[PDB]
Amino acid sequence: DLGKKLLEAARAGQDDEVRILMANGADVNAKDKDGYTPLHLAAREGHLEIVEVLLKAGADVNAKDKDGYTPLHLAAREGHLEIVEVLLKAGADVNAKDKDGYTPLHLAAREGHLEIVEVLLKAGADVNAQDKFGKTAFDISIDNGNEDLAEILQ
Secondary structure (H helix, E strand, C coil): CHHHHHHHHHHHCCHHHHHHHHHCCCCCCCCCCCCCCHHHHHHHHCCHHHHHHHHHCCCCCCCCCCCCCCHHHHHHHHCCHHHHHHHHHCCCCCCCCCCCCCCHHHHHHHHCCHHHHHHHHHCCCCCCCCCCCCCCHHHHHHHCCCHHHHHHHC
């Protein structure tokens, strides 16, 4: 099954493998057990050229895993700035909420990725979005004593 192969190749950052698999009929929207797609996996792992290739092939940019994580959640959490930008341009939902109401802004804030936060804000991220415990990205910045983050957000 080619879908499984593309998932592994996307996760492992095997550009030439991704290219050959796709050239030979691999499903770009293949899903693993947890609802991860090749795009989730590449975005998480930092494989920018694979991300760009999947996007162009019509990969669902807003695919959700079983917990409502999109590829943008994973890229913003992991600090892959270039991948974050490419996703947003491809129509990524900057305000997508996972099962617990966490947005990519929450995850970038929580991880302390300032540059990602700026990009998310410029692209329409809701500063007032609250998770299931009622916390905002600003709340996180106050917890961590992150003055640069707090400012950017408020």
